[PDB]
Amino acid sequence: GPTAGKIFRAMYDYMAADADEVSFKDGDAIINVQAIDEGWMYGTVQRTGRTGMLPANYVEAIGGGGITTIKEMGRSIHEIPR
Amino acid sequence: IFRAMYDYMAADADEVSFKDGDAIINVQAIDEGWMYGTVQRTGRTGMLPANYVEAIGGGGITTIKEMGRSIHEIPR
Amino acid sequence: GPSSDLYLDSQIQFTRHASDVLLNLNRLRSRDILTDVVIVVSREQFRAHKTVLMACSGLFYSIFTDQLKRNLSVINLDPEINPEGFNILLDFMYTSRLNLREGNIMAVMATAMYLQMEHVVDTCRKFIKA
Amino acid sequence: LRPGGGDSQIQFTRHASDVLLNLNRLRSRDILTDVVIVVSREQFRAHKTVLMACSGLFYSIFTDQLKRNLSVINLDPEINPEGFNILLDFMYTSRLNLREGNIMAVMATAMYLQMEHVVDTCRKFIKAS
Ligand code: NA
C-alpha cells in the first residue's frame, strides 16, 4: 500500500558555478535525486527540467510521518479519595 | 415547564409527537387525561396525554458556563 | 505462533487530565496534605498550596515570588477582605466553580479585585449587569 | 441572562487547563519546586503535589509520615530517564509524547509509577484487541 515519503525543496536561491551544476530558486522542488554525498546532491530542478549537482546545504527534506495527535477522553490518573 | 417521560407518536394531526426527555412548554390542562402544549424541540403544538409528562419544579440554581481564560498566565 | 496483533511519533492528548489533576489537588487540600501556607483573613484561617494560589492570583504570585517573604508559612490579608468572599474564591481556584448565592456578588467581586484575579472580576462585571 | 434573585454557579471550562499550564510554567522556572527525582544519570525538579496527584507511587511516598519531607528521591536503577521525562511532561501538560522506540520504556515507567490509566492507554496504542 502507499507509504509516507519524503521530497526535497530548495531553501535559498543558488546560481550554478559550473556546467555540471544547476541553478534554482528558494522553494523549487528538487526531484528524482540520485545521490547525496558530502555537501552535494545530484537531482533535477522540476521548474526548469535541468539536472545536475546542487549544494546539499541549500535544500531541505520534507515528509515522513510527522507527529499525529490522538485524543484520549478517559480518566487519566488515579483519583485521590475524599 | 414540563418534561416528557416517554416517547409518544401522535395518533392524529391534532396530537403532537415527542421523545422521552423533551421539554413541553406553554402547557394547559384540557381534562385530567389530556394537556395541550408545545414540543420545544420541534415547535409543534397540540394535544398530548397528561400521564406522559411531569412538571419540573422551579427554584433551581442557574449554571453559567464561562469558556474564556479564567486566570492570569505565568510567563515562561 | 499466534498473531502478534501489534501495530507495525504520536502525541496522546488526555482531554480530562487537567481537570483530574485539579480535582486531586482539591482532595489534597481537603485532607490537609502537603499544604504549605495558611491564609489569615480577619479571624478565619484557610490552609492551601502556594503553587495553586500563585497559579490563580496575581497578588499571591507577587507574594510567593517576593524574596522577602520566601520563609513565610502564614500570610495575613488586608483586614478589609471578607472571609466569606475569600472562601468562595479559594474554592473557585481548586474547583473551576464560582459560587454566587443571592446578594454575594459584590463581596465576591471585591475579593477578586483584591486578589488581582482580573478574569474573575470581568466575569463578575458581566454577571452583575445581567 | 439570569433572574435578579436566586443562586448561580459559574463554571470555568478551561480553568483546570489554565492552572496546569501555570504549574508547568512554575516548574520550567524552578519556582516552588520542592523535590528532585533522580533517574540514573538524570535529575528532574518537580512539585510534590503534582507528582502525588498523578502517581500512586509518589502518593504513597509523600503521605508516609516519615517520607513526606524527603527532598531528593532516587528511583530504582532499572528506571529509564527518557521514560520518566515523558511521564513527567504528561503530568504537567496532559500530552504523552511517544515514539515506537520508546513506547516500551514509557509503559514500563508508567507501571513502576503506578499510573494505570496511562498503562492502559499504552496497551491500546501498541496492540489491537
Ligand atoms: Na533532566
Numbering used by the authors:
A (entry chain D): -1 to 80
B (entry chain C): 5 to 80
C (entry chain B): -7 to 0, 6 to 127
D (entry chain A): 0 to 128
Quote the authors verbatim.
We have shown that the surface of the BCL6 BTB domain contains versatile interaction interfaces with the potential to mediate diverse lattices in a range of crystallization conditions.
As proof of principle, we chose to crystallize the SH3 domain of human nebulin by incorporating it as the guest protein within a BCL6 BTB-domain lattice via its genetic fusion to the NCoR1BBD1 sequence; the nebulin SH3 domain structure has previously been solved by NMR, thereby providing solution-state information to enable the determination of potential artefactual conformations induced by the scaffold, and it has a largest dimension of ∼28 Å. The structure of the nebulin SH3 domain was resolved to 1.56 Å resolution. The hydrophobic patch of the BTB domain provided a site for interaction either with the NCoR1BBD2 appendage or with a co-crystallized SH3 domain that was recruited via genetic fusion to a natural NCoR1 corepressor BBD1 sequence; from this perspective, the BTB domain served as a chaperone for the SH3 domain and provided an interaction site to facilitate the 3D ordering of the crystal.
